[PDB]
Amino acid sequence: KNPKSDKFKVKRFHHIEFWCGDATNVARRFSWGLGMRFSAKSDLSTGNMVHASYLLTSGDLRFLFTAPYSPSLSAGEIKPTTTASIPSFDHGSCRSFFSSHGLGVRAVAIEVEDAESAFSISVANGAIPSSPPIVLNEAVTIAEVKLYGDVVLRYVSYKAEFLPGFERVEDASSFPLDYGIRRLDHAVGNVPELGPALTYVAGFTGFHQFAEFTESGLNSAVLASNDEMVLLPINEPVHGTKRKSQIQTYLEHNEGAGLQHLALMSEDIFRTLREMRKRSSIGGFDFMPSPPPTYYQNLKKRVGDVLSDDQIKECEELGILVDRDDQGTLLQIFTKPLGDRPTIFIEIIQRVGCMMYQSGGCGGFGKGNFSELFKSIEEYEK
Amino acid sequence: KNPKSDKFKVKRFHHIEFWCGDATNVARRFSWGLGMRFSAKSDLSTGNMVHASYLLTSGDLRFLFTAPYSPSLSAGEIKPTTTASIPSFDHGSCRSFFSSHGLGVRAVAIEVEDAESAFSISVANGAIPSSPPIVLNEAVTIAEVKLYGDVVLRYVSYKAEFLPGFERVEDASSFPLDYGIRRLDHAVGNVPELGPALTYVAGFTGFHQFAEFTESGLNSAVLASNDEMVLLPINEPVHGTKRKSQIQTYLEHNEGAGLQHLALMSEDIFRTLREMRKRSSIGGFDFMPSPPPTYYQNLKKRVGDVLSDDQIKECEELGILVDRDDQGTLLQIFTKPLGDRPTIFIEIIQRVGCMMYQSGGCGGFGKGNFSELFKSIEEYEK
Ligand SMILES: O=Cc1ccc(O)cc1
Ligand SMILES: O=Cc1ccc(O)cc1
Ligand SMILES: [Co+2]
Ligand SMILES: [Co+2]
C-alpha cells in the first residue's frame, strides 16, 4: 500500500554530487566510462575562486564533480561576498569528507517545489540541518539536511540552467557521448543500524516504505516519495555468517555510513552495457563477474514470457541479471567499485512493465537474485 | 661544455609518482588520454593496507599513481611491520601534499647504481633528506631527498619487476594502448628563487648546467647528469611586466614551489598527437591553442632543411611547435593543465639530429619559440 504521506511536494531526483580531490580527472573518467556529456562548469574560468565543479549529463541524469581550490585563493572572501556557485561548499568539510571516505557521493539532490519550505518542514520534523536555504540570483533555492553519514539530502527548487553561476560548456569540449543512460532510478545507503536510519529519514520526509529484505549479508528497506519516483533503499549489515557482510566491509573502508551505489536507468541496457564493456579496460568501468551459464539456463524458465531466446542470449553475452516482481521485470548489472576503496559502485538497470508512463520501482530491486544466484552457482560446479 | 661532475652514477629517469586523492580515477584518465598501459598494481588485492598504487607504462615511461586508504586499515602496523610496498609513503604527508597542491608530482625517480650510496653522498653534499635508503626484499633500494617544494628526488637501484610487492596486472584489464610515447625527456620545476634552487640541486648531485634563458615571464636553467639523459630545468618568475608571470601564477595556485611539467618523448609525435587530439574531448587531455598560420609560414623559412612541406603541413594540422638549435630540431606541443588547478601540465616532444643513439637535449627546449610566437602573432593580426 501507499499512504502518500510526503510532508512536502517532491518532484524528482535532480543531481548527484561527488566530492573529489581532483574534479577534472574524475569527471573526465566518468564521462568516457558512462557516456555522459560535459554540459556545465563553475570554476576559475567562471570566476569561482572557491571550488571547481563540473557537471556531466546523460538524459535527465546529472553527475556533479566538485573539488576545493587552495583556500588561499578565497582568503579575503566571506559567505556574503563568496565567489562559490554552491554556497554550502566548505573547504574544510570537503577535505575532511574526502580524507575520511575517499571518492564518494556528498549530496543526493532532489527537486522540490519550494526548497525553503522543504528545509523548514524537514528540520521541524527531526532533520539535522546541514546548510540553510539559500537563494541564488533570485532564481534557485537550495538547502541541505543530513541523510546518513556525511551524505546530505539536498533540496532544489526553481521559480520557473543548472545553477546560477554555472556556464554552458564550450561546444568543442562538449562531445555528445551517449550510451543510453537516462535518469537516476535510486540511490542506496549503507548504515550500521537500519532501524534508526529508517525512522530518522521517514520521520522528516514522510516517505513511505516500498519494500524490504530479510538471509545473506544485509537487511534493507526502501523509502519512497508520493509517486514513488524518489526511491531510497537503506542497508545494514547482518553480523554472523560464514562470509563477512559486504555492508560491513563497506562501513570499514568508508569509515562509517555513506552512499553505497547509484542505480542508473538505461533506455537500452543492451547498448549501454555493450558500450560500457567496450571501454572497461581503456579508462571506463569494470563490471562484476558475470553469472554462470546455469543462471541463464534457468532464465528461460523464469522470464521466457518476457525475453526471447535471443534477448536472453544477449543478457548472457553481457552478464545482465534479471529479476521479476508480481508486476514487472528488472534487468540489472553492477560495476566494480568506482574508485580505490571497495565502497561506492554503480548499477545499470532497465525496467519492463507497469505501464499506465512507467510506474517507479517496477520489478523491484533484485531481491530474488540472491537465491537464484547461489541456486545457479551450485548447479555450475555440478 | 660538460664537466661531467656527477657525484654518483646516475643511469636514467625511472618513474614519476603522482600523489592523488583517488588513484584509480587519475590512472584510468591518464591511461586513455596518453595511451599508457596498466602494467602493475599494489593495493588491497596485493595485501597493501596502506596505499593504492597503479603504474602506467608506455615504452620506458612509467607513471605511478598513489593515494592513501583510510589510516584505520593500517592502525595496528608500524614501519617494521608495514604492508605498504612504498616504505616512504606516509598517510599524513600524502594528504597534506594533496590538500596543499592538488594533483601533482610527488617523486621524480631516477635509477642510480646504488641508492644507498646516492643518498649518503647527496646528504653529505647538502641534500635535505626525506626518506632514508630502504632495501625491499633484498632486491631494490630506494631513498628520497628533497628536490624543491614538496617534490622529492627519488633514487632507485636494482641488484640485477617494477618494485617488490607490486603485481603484474591481469592481462584482461591491461589493454595494449600505445600512441607512440617512449620515455621521459625532462621534468621542469618552478621555484620562487632560481639561484638558491640551482645552487642547492647542483650542490648535492654534481649535475652541470646545460642551458639557460634570460624577456617574457621567467628565467630558467637546466641541470644535467654526466651523459645528460637526466635533464632538470628550473624556472623562476620575472616580476615586472605587462602580463603576470605564469611561473608566478603557478606558485600561487600550487601554494609554492613544485613540478611544472613533464616532457614525454614520442617516437612519432604525429601519431601521438593525432591519437591524443582524437580523445581530448572524450576523457583525454586538451592542448594549448595552436599557433597561427603566420607561424607555420615562417617555419618553411626556418626548418625547410628539416621538414618537408607535407610534414610542416601536418605540424600545422596538429598545432606542433618547432625550434632548432645549432645541433638539432625540436618538435614540441603542450597540453592544458592536467587537473583542476593551472599548475602541472604535459609536453610532447620529439628530437631530430645529434646522431652518434641520440644525445640528450638535442635541439634544446624551445627558447627560440617565445620570439617566433610573438613575432608570428604580430603578423596574423596583420
Ligand atoms: O539495495 C538492494 C535491495 C535489495 C532488495 C530490497 O528489497 C531492497 C534493496
Ligand atoms: O622549461 C623551459 C625552458 C626553456 C628554455 C630553456 O633554456 C630552459 C628551459
Ligand atoms: Co539497487
Ligand atoms: Co620543456
Curated annotation (Swiss-Prot), chains A, B:
It is found in: Cytoplasm. The keyword Repeat applies. Homodimer. This is 4-hydroxyphenylpyruvate dioxygenase. GO terms for biological process: L-phenylalanine catabolic process; tyrosine catabolic process. Fe cation binds at residues 186, 261, 347. Binds 1 Fe cation per subunit. Its cofactor is Fe cation. Residues 12-158, 183-336 form the VOC domain. It catalyses: 3-(4-hydroxyphenyl)pyruvate + O2 = homogentisate + CO2. Catalyzes the conversion of 4-hydroxyphenylpyruvic acid to homogentisic acid, one of the steps in tyrosine catabolism. GO terms for cellular component: cytoplasm. Pfam families: Glyoxalase. Its EC number is 1.13.11.27. It is an enzyme of class 1 (oxidoreductase). Keywords: Cytoplasm, Dioxygenase, Iron, Metal-binding, Oxidoreductase, Phenylalanine catabolism, Repeat, Tyrosine catabolism.
